[model samples]
Target: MKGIIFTEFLDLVEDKFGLEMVDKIITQSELESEGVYTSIGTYRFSEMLQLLQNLSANTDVSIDDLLLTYAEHFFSVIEDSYPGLLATYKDPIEMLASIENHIHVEVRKIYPDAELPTFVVEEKTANSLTMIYKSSRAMHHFGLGLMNKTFEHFNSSAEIILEKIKEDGTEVKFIINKNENLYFQ
Candidate 1:
């Protein structure tokens, strides 16, 4: 079964269930970097796809409906697995990206078009390095939040994070200020 149009179902999930529910799973996936390892990521993505397909066949649900249900259920699991991620990290854009990535990885197994990216993190003496997420397909839409979430999770809870969240609540924005050392790929 094909995955549904993303933004629309995403809207429905948020509108029907509180954004809080989605945020937890989304953050957990992002915060933890669920698909970090190649072998494990592929296995999980495939498993998720089969699960989605099974649900579609059993319930006679459209792809959209199935995905929506999966998301709702997935978040429920996330709450039990990653309570801290759910309770905090309410940024909508990041939440949105995490959901997108979660679906994309699963969808790619079925439809090669939603190609997943390679995990590339180059360390230049710990302080600086060039990070490149190698995509399997050219048309792949990059999930910037991949890097964003990873950085946030790995970094010490800096004062800047609190300042950013306090000044801007759950709906945070990402901006690229290319100065000397910081540049996103």
Candidate 2:
């Protein structure tokens, strides 16, 4: 996993849960890195799981809910760090469809070693998209939150339905239907 993710997660924890909770989760998890992270570095994915698990246990929030909040925070990072990237897309569906071919390509150019999920475009039209997200990490709700935020950022709206293709959430399908009322209004 990339350190930027870990670092931002820690920041989000501190911001919402406070510094004390941050220390509590880190101390609760048996992390090899001792919760130390750098944005430009890489660490074991297990470290992330450890911290997330502990955070959920202590905060009394489900792991899925935590992922959603974390992903919302992550989207803000994207908005701040790479505003130009989002500006190029005229529609949320178009933007999301390009995740695999365009966005991740550019992401790799910056972090060559970053491990990204694969987004397979099953089908797509101007106002709708069907895509499959495959990742070793079972963070589908995190992806869901980012998708929700994408539409929010564009001042648009959509009904994004998620279907789990696998029991563990490693593989999931997203069906996005743009609400016509937004533009019609």
Candidate 3:
């Protein structure tokens, strides 16, 4: 995984939980990097699992829920840091449908070695999209959270449904239906 992920996750922990909670989670995890991270550094994904497990154990929050919240928080950073990227899209559905072809392409330019999930569009229309997310990380809830934020970023809304294609969540499908009544400028 990329270090930016760890950095953002730790930032979320500190902001939402507390500095002490951040220390607690890091101290509990057996991190190879000793819980230290740089935005451009690469680290083991296992360390993230360890941190999430420890955080969940301490706070009694499910890891999936934590990932969802973390992703929402990360989306704000993306908005602030890459306004032009989001501005290119007039609709959330259109933006999302181009994730693999456009967004990830740009993402690779910045973080060339970033291990991003593959978003394969199964179907797409003006107000709807269905894509299969495949990643060894099994972080579908995080993707779902990002999808939620994309609609909100566009001043729109959608009903997003998820289905597991594999038992482990490494392969899942997302169905997004834009709400006709939900749009604003």
Candidate 3: 10-residue stretch with minimal lDDT = 176-185
Q: What tens digits encode model 2's per-residue C-alpha lDDT throughout 1-185?
A: 89999999999999999999999998898988888999898998889999999999998999999999999879999999999999999788889999999999999999888888999999999889999999998888888889989988978788989899998999999999988654552
**Highest lDDT scorer:** 3
Error of 1 at 79 (Å): 2.2
Clashes of each: 0, 0, 0
| Tens digits of per-residue lDDT for model 1, 86-114 | 44444332333344345345445655654
Clashes of 2: 0
Stretches of model 2 off by over 4 angstroms after superposition = 183-185
**C-alpha RMSD in Å of predicted model 1 compared with the true structure:** 15.6
lDDT of 1: 0.36
Candidate 3 local lDDT, 1-185, one digit each (tens): 99989999998899988999999999998999999999989998899999999999999999889999999889998999899998899888889988999998999999888889999998999889999999999999999899989998877789999899998999999988988753345
Better of 1 and 3 by TM-score: 3
* TM accuracy, model 2: 0.95
Order of quality (lDDT): 3, 2, 1
TM-score of 3: 0.95
How much lDDT does each candidate structure score?
0.36, 0.91, 0.91
Q: List the residue pairs that clash in candidate 2.
A: none
lDDT at 65, model 3: 94
